[PDB]
């Protein structure tokens, strides 16, 4: 059968081609993971549907209800196979559905407009002037609240509680934010996310200090599904073949405009 | 008791000063050695720490298809698990599982300070300074199996160099690359090459990228039913910030350069 594949509307990994409105099915999405998706399902030998997640989120379980959102959700609740996304592994997830090894590796990173006096987690912690934020239903912001390190429990203290919300809907909007706020808004966002918009027209922005943690992005299956380890195959080959290595070059790199 | 395979490379693991009057676990220390001690606690086991009979990671004997190394004592049940610098790669996941991996890494050059290489294909381009790999591991692999030009080239000049290029083990490589006077570079992984680099007598460089990109994983016998909590207490490890802090510890704490 065709397999579902769920991703999300997140540049470079998904983008609509900009004739999409002329093509059909998969033929209207490129980026780093529809180039991915089409080598697993030619490694793997299976025909497969690109579908973007319908609430445009990544996945969190709601507190209250305890429902799972966003392609975790899809995964979880049997309306999509596979997730080929920028999806973090993380603990709570790996609890409900299965992760291959790695296929690109990431840390949490600040994101400034250009000239804002700030090098570090410790600057944005030990001031005010300067407000800073999150994408308001991932990892990152999981990543803060679960914090017991003494700066990013600081940080979490402020972003919680501070008016209005610091917290951001999608990449965009805190990229946005940073760009129009003249340096008084600093984006907490993967160092992935923060490299490729460096990499952009208008160049105002910049990724400063190191990474504030290491982890990695993997394709998820929902948990025992006999896709799983094939697909777990196939990183690894790919990533011995030197292809994951060429697709992060083609898509941040190679189409650099600063 | 969980029979923990692990082998002698700092700093991951190795005996302490003072190992002679000390039993069991307690000779040894190091970044696998903590590694271990936090996994057992979280997961709840007791276990015994033993290095490997070969002193090898493991590799598959082309003739005899039998695994040598930390590998072998998986897969021939000699051992439960294996919490070693062991780098996951495709031929060993067909037979051992692997967690996520722990600590990043790529191959990558050391040279003796002022040797004048920057690159693989600074040293692909010439012939005066010779170069090599450790024997039975993951980096010569890389080499005998690139279709990437550089890297081919490369394999053709070590497979048939004389004398040997390749070597035992790490310190091996490391004190050939020390004693050649800057005609010997050394293959190795970044992790292996950084350590080196922060440590007396301060006469080597890590220099360039890295080659590649993987990860270090811990590994257990295929269907193990410790692989899946093994690979929890991995994940938990490093949200929690301790593999960064045990990283540090040995690694730059430890620095003497
Ligand atoms: C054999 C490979 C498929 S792999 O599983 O090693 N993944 C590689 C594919 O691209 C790059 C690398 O991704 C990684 C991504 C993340 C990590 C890390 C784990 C724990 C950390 C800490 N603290 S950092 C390692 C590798
Ligand atoms: N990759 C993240 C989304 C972005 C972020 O949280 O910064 C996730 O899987 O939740
Ligand atoms: N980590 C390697 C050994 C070192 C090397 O090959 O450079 C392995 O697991 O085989
Ligand atoms: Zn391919
Ligand atoms: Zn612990
Ligand atoms: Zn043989």
Redesign the interface.
């Known amino acids: 059968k065709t397999v579902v594949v769920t991703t999300i509307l997140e540049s470079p990994y998904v983008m609509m081609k900009k004739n999409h409105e002329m093509l059909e099915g998969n033929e209207r999405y490129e980026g780093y993971c529809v180039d991915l998706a089409a080598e697993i399902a030619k490694h793997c030998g299976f025909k497969y549907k690109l579908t973007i997640v319908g609430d445009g989120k990544y996945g969190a379980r709601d507190a209250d209800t305890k429902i799972w959102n966003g392609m975790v959700g899809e995964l979880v609740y049997g309306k999509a196979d596979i997730a080929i996304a920028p999806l973090t592994?993380?603990?709570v997830r790996?609890?409900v559905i299965d992760?291959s090894?790695?296929f690109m590796?990431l840390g949490i990173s600040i994101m400034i407009k250009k000239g804002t006096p700030i090098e570090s987690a410790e600057d944005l912690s030990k001031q005010t002037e300067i407000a800073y934020g999150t994408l308001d239903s991932g990892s990152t912001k999981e990543?803060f609240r679960?914090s017991?390190?003494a700066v990013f429990d600081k940080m979490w203290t402020y972003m919680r509680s501070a008016e209005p919300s610091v917290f951001v809907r999608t990449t965009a909007e805190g990229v946005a934010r940073v760009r129009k706020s003249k340096g008084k808004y600093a984006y907490l966002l993967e160092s992935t996310m923060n490299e490729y918009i460096e990499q952009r027209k208008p160049c105002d922005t910049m990724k400063v200090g190191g990474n504030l943690?290491?982890?990695?992005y993997?394709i998820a299956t929902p948990k025992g599904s006999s896709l799983g380890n094939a697909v777990?195959?196939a990183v690894?080959?790919l990533?011995?073949?030197?292809l994951?290595?060429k697709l992060k070059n083609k898509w941040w790199y190679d189409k650099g405009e600063c």
């Open positions: 592994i993380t603990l790996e609890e992760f090894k790695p590796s990543f679960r017991k390190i943690d290491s982890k990695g993997g777990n195959l690894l080959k990533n011995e073949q030197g994951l290595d």
